[PDB]
């Protein structure tokens, strides 16, 4: 379904996304997406019931850049550490068009939040549903959907999930 | 003296709110008694959430779980999610469709109106050759159904109340606030777009304050002709006012507005109705102790919305909710204010912008809506 | 009026339990004072858990940590897990083998009976050439040992009590409850099969009720000639009654039963003895505040069991415990009942099945055991 | 010890199990086992002390189907979401008999529970100890042992761990 | 009687501390009022943490968040982290550099000394063409600044106090303890090595006790000429005394000691100054309810330290902190002692080692520092 | 960057470290390091601010042995279970000297603590930053750095992170 080089790059993509959005370099979050890539962060209750509302729907890499700028310069928020624990990813399909190949893959995740002097808590838990394509810069996300179980949000989601 | 002893409000009027109004659990329990469980209509949902007969949605009033179910006749019943036998909270799902309510500990069955329809072994069990058990024959189902609530449905929204001698919904809101209520809920059929939920570790009143605070948006939300009106008792209020991807605004005016561009309506004590540009939502306050509350956003649209307008509402919902460019600030500052209050509960706030008078203004540079809220609070709570 | 203010029980008798009996923490502290720390034998374990000298198992009585250790002479001592110097809870392991107890903060050494044997520098320290420090010559070791408990071992089970003037165990249970106790603990030596543990967020009494509830199993547990007996004060009770993989039942009757098929025996307030089909266990209640308790299942078999019987018990344990086909319902309904109680603590339950009498019955269609339980409760706590 | 194809299938097995038992298709849990496969969920204290009692011992695929049916149709339980975060699996051994090869592998896991409007909590944490075999349908479990640290169970375990 | 009811201290003196001294929340709030918020200097940090103007560090006193900032003139201000408008805890970072403090809820601006410099729309907003809103013109900025605290800096350490009528820092410490204070903080400029943090679930007093406990270290820490002195009021104290990789010791004496090799100085109620071999740190107590406290280790060196001495201090820090060979035991026993106290809050400890005398000794074999601590405690708390 | 066998051994190294330091054989912790290997456990605030202080700094395999002995025989501590959930590792670089090849890799971790009858909690969360070398016994750690987010430590760190 995928050869070793692609599987290596895929696990690296999941890990890179997780660890970069936990680091001080989280503003590089849009670099994981192609220019037409989308990012949706949606509660399980809306997703399972066919309700289209998300917690966050960035319908372009440009809108993702918008979100990064808003978070970095226009939103007053409690600073916090976050730590992505991404479980073992699974490869579901590889499909082909005239654009090239698309890889569909999933991975469960747990985002752990630590406020400055507080306990580490399960901030947001759910799973990724990704369509991944290959660009000259490596594997990138064409679409990322985060269906999260943690519907009762601990007050606010600021940094990328 | 940082912690209070037999506290008394600092004088008369309401231009200085004491910190212990937010930090005392006895005061909070009295608030549950007098604002949520008596003399008030509290929001329980939207009609579109339960379109067909048997459709039920579990929700809350204060800290009491209730069920809003559509009756086979077409009306809406609201019952308390507590059983009559041994008080089990029997309804566990958030929503679904049932012909009747039932508790499985001993399988007591109730109609969708709360009437006790069945009690296993009620007349006993004859075995060989005796009848064993049974209920005392003075006990009849008429007196052990689910606690029923009175229901007010209007414009697609559904309120309920434990107090059955509460003023009618229209008189509860008053004419001016009811005008804006009907302005959003104008009789069209609504379509649920979805839910967002957040747990905010602050006193529930701080949310009302935050939506009775008109001039903080121009100072707190760095992602940015007004008038403020109140009902007779100063409890409800209405605030009226006139990037890489252009879709993140793409604001199109709508005729039904029909001239104010934004109206934030606080219906005390349970709900906020938000009309902001093209996003329309209800915000349900569900308190949990004196220092925390859950906040449920129901974003909805109208049936006459084509798919472009649905996408418009959905994309502009990115400004609000627990992750919005504008709305996350609110939960953050509410939590930080609660931390401050708990830090020195004998101190006081100063809500003196625009003077000390309480009344409808034609500008947004005033804290008069909070001053009226706490006038009403002092009157209702005897503080 | 949803929250109580100096509440009084709804009349005399015990056919209606008020909700606040489950929601008041002062009532819970009084419960600990009068039912767990006085006038009662409480379960502390099985002899097989400490077969050899020095073998100890840490456990709890109410909310007080204790250690049950087998003495070098062959007896069983039970001491409080609190040190005499500065009250440190020194024993951290669940089980093990110790020549003596010792606290490492200042290394105070106690015999396996709880007697203070050693205090470093007790008589002082000779340095140059003066003696420095030491305990006051009023200080005597005899007066600073571990709080010793009364110990009762019978049939292989071990109870204990802080109260030293408590009635003997046999008279504590009464003849009938002691008969069923001995029916399970018939003198054979027991084999520990294992432990299961679950934290249930409900009032501890709700567990007793659940095993003093004879007709809930036939209505709640969707996985499917009886009599109910009590002791003199109505505190203890005994309930007596007569698929893809076939191994999940394979029920074989055992001679020691020998007439009844199942007996659930509640020993107030601390333990349940379960004999169901081929599974044999103790169920230990360990309360934590008014609204939660831990529940420890000790599943065991007998020494004369071959490996066929060991599996009978092991596979049939799939029906019980925190994940069993039958037992998970119990914790779930207990949690939901507690939520209901906290929702409106002024209300009351209705336990009227089988009438209002308190007494031994020959059928399962009554709530009389709960009525007796709360008769005893009102008597002991004066409400 | 294993080639890339088998390693890919093995990581996919761990991930498939985790994500499928978190989804609405959790009733397909028995399909990860051969017909004689076993599933045991045992506390660490019982396992380490040689006590044979488990929290749940399903000694055949038939008994696993029984369990699925019991959960689905005969047990009243509070509904909740669960989310398996499976750590990086490790391969310990590959052995050979006349049926074919057996792979022994382990992986730590954390099951995160979210009741309907509640916080996300660590419901049950432990590790898997598995014997994995190859069938015409792919890799399957011959035996799965779940030794869990979270002995004080948050009231009840209903869905598959 | 396991739980106290109108408790009274067990007799006179302070050789037996009742368990409820650690388990009562009213006592804890009185402790905050009388030991942390009045008549005491409490530790807020080191000057090296804020070398340049605008440099700030957020910290706590009792349970009240404060900010320690270096003033543009070179002094050190300490202000309360609570806003004057509606009490919002506005400073969210731990440290940084600010021209001024400001709260973003309504953007109130304060000087680095706490003086309210700016209030948006204080004077109103003229729109078209009326002036609207504004603060009442009797409202003065002078009366709504941040609560300012008095600051005492010496030797590089910085204490603060809400009480402005507090005795000077030198008289607060007394001559004997100020000698050892200055012995560590001898005027050299310090370089911060780093921070360690631990949440210990025990009463905060247990930490003070632990560093007023001279004979536990040779018995608890199995990884191992003295005198112990106190101030006039028995509150502050000083305890003075004279492997595979060898780097884990490499103890080298340094001239500034000079003669005592180790000094543990407790400054009541907030801080410990530790000089152990070549590791020097402050340990800040930050209480959170009666049953927990945060503990912040600031490990530091001196500016004249080369690269050898810096690494020496760093490697020797492996014995201390929340993971140290010596220090982890302390948090463990403090937590376990708190558990013991909560188990039976009517009981009492026995601190009778060295007799009942309170005074400076020439040996380690005494509990006199704890007896003096609780003499002072009874006096300040009226028990 | 790395071939399949090295990638397999790498994931096995992360998983082996995690599961061994959760087991009764945690005393074998020093065996994951070469004789000159280092182990540093440092708060995020110290690391990001350039403050050199660690929570624990073992500057050789000998000092790691010291720590193991101290924990096993010289420290009174509450016993507890710990459970490492190591997210998907990422390989950053492979460098070369005459000493051999060094692989630089990272992986986020969450250590879950279970005290004897308590809830499972996030004890310590952060990430590993490792330099990995190949020895005749397999891949070993030359240096392991644990930058942890959970700065407010739940009272004490005893077993290896
Ligand atoms: S409690 Fe509702 S049926 Fe018995
Ligand atoms: S407290 Fe037990 S030895 Fe000091
Ligand atoms: S609270 Fe600081 S400005 Fe309103
Ligand atoms: Fe706002
Ligand atoms: Fe049952
Ligand atoms: Fe010590």
Swiss-Prot record, chains A, D, F:
Its EC number is 1.14.13.172. It catalyses: salicylate + NADH + O2 + H(+) = 2,5-dihydroxybenzoate + NAD(+) + H2O. GO terms for molecular function: salicylate 5-hydroxylase activity. The keyword NAD applies. One of its GO terms (cellular component) is catalytic complex. The keyword Transcription regulation does not apply. InterPro entries: NTF2-like_dom_sf (IPR032710), Rng_hydr_dOase-bsu (IPR000391), SnoaL-like (IPR037401). Keywords: Aromatic hydrocarbons catabolism, Monooxygenase, NAD, Oxidoreductase, Plasmid. It is an enzyme of class 1 (oxidoreductase). This is Salicylate 5-hydroxylase, small oxygenase component. It comes from Ralstonia sp.
Swiss-Prot record, chains B, C, E:
It comes from the Bacteria. One of its GO terms (molecular function) is salicylate 5-hydroxylase activity. [2Fe-2S] cluster binds at residues 83, 85, 103, 106. Residues 41-160 form the Rieske domain. Its EC number is 1.14.13.172. Residues 1-12 are annotated as: Disordered. Binds 1 Fe cation per subunit. Keywords: 2Fe-2S, Aromatic hydrocarbons catabolism, Iron, Iron-sulfur, Metal-binding, Monooxygenase, NAD, Oxidoreductase, Plasmid. Pathway: Aromatic compound metabolism; naphthalene degradation. Its cofactor is Fe cation; [2Fe-2S] cluster. Disruption phenotype: Cells lacking this gene are not able to convert salicylate to gentisate. It holds the Pfam family Ring_hydroxyl_A. One of its GO terms (biological process) is salicylic acid catabolic process. Belongs to the bacterial ring-hydroxylating dioxygenase alpha subunit family. Oxygenase component of the salicylate 5-hydroxylase (S5H) multicomponent enzyme system which catalyzes the 5-hydroxylation of salicylate to gentisate. Active only on substrates with a ring-substituted carboxylate group with an adjacent hydroxyl group. Primarily active against salicylate and substituted salicylates, but not against 2-hydroxycinnamate, 3-hydroxycinnamate, 2-hydroxyphenylacetate, 3-hydroxyphenylacetate, 2-hydroxybenzophenone, 1-hydroxy-2-naphthoate, 4-methoxysalicylate or 2-hydroxyacetophenone. The salicylate 5-hydroxylase (S5H) multicomponent enzyme system is composed of an electron transfer component and an oxygenase component. The electron transfer component is comprised of a ferredoxin reductase (NagAa) and a ferredoxin (NagAb), and the oxygenase component is formed by a large subunit (NagG) and a small subunit (NagH). This is Salicylate 5-hydroxylase, large oxygenase component.
């Amino acid at each position: 379904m995928v050869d070793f080089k692609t599987y290596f790059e895929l696990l690296n993509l999941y890990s890179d996304y997780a660890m970069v959005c936990d680091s001080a370099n989280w503003e590089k979050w849009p670099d994981f997406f192609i220019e037409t890539g989308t990012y949706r962060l949606q509660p399980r209750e809306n997703f399972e019931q066919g309700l289209p509302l998300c917690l966050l729907a960035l319908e372009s890499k440009a809108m993702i850049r918008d979100r990064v700028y808003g978070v970095k310069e226009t939103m007053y928020h409690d600073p916090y550490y976050q730590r992505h624990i991404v479980g073992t990813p699974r490869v579901l399909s590889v499909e082909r068009d005239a654009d090239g190949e698309r890889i569909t893959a999933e991975a469960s995740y747990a985002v752990i939040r630590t406020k400055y002097d507080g306990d580490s808590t399960i901030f947001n838990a759910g799973y990724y549903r990704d369509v991944i394509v290959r660009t000259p810069e490596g594997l990138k996300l064409k679409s990322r959907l985060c269906v999260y179980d943690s519907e009762m949000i601990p007050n606010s989601v600021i940094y990328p999930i | 003296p940082v912690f209070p002893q037999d506290p008394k409000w600092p004088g008369e009027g309401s231009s200085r709110v004491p910190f212990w109004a937010y930090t005392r659990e006895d005061l909070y329990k009295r608030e549950l008694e007098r604002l949520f469980y008596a003399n008030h209509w509290c929001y329980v949902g939207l009609e579109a959430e339960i379109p067909n007969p048997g459709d039920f949605k579990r929700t809350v009033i204060g800290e009491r779980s209730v069920i809003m179910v559509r009756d086979p006749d077409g009306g809406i019943n609201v019952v308390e999610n507590v059983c009559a036998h041994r008080g089990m909270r029997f309804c566990r799902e958030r929503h679904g469709n049932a012909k009747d309510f039932f508790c499985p500990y001993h399988q007591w069955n109730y109609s969708l109106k709360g009437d006790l329809q069945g009690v296993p072994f009620r007349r006993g069990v004859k075995q060989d050759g005796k009848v064993n058990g049974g209920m005392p024959k003075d006990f009849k189902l008429e007196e052990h159904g689910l606690t029923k609530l009175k229901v007010a449905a209007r414009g697609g929204a559904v309120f309920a109340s434990f107090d059955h001698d509460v003023e009618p919904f229209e008189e509860f809101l008053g004419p001016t606030i009811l005008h804006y209520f009907d302005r959003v809920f104008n009789g069209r059929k609504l379509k649920i777009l979805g839910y967002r939920r957040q747990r905010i570790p602050g006193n529930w009143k701080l949310m009302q304050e935050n939506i009775k605070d008109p001039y903080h948006p121009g100072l707190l939300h760095t992602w940015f002709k007004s008038e403020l009106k109140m009902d007779a008792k100063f409890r409800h209020a209405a605030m009226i006012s006139t990037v890489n991807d252009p879709r993140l605004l793409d604001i199109v005016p709508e005729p039904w507005w029909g001239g104010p561009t934004a109206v934030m309506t606080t219906i005390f004590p349970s709900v906020i109705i938000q009309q902001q540009v093209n996003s329309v939502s209800t915000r349900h306050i569900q308190p949990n102790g004196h220092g925390s509350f859950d906040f449920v956003w129901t974003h909805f649209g109208f049936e006459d919305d084509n798919e472009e307008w649905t996408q418009r509402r959905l994309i502009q919902a990115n400004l609000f909710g627990p992750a919005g460019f504008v709305s996350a600030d609110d939960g953050e500052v509410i939590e930080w204010s609660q931390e401050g209050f708990e830090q020195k509960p004998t101190h006081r706030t100063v809500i003196e912008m625009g003077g000390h008078e309480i009344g409808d203004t034609d500008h947004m540079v005033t804290e008069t809506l909070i001053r009226g809220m706490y006038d009403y609070w002092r009157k209702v709570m005897g503080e």
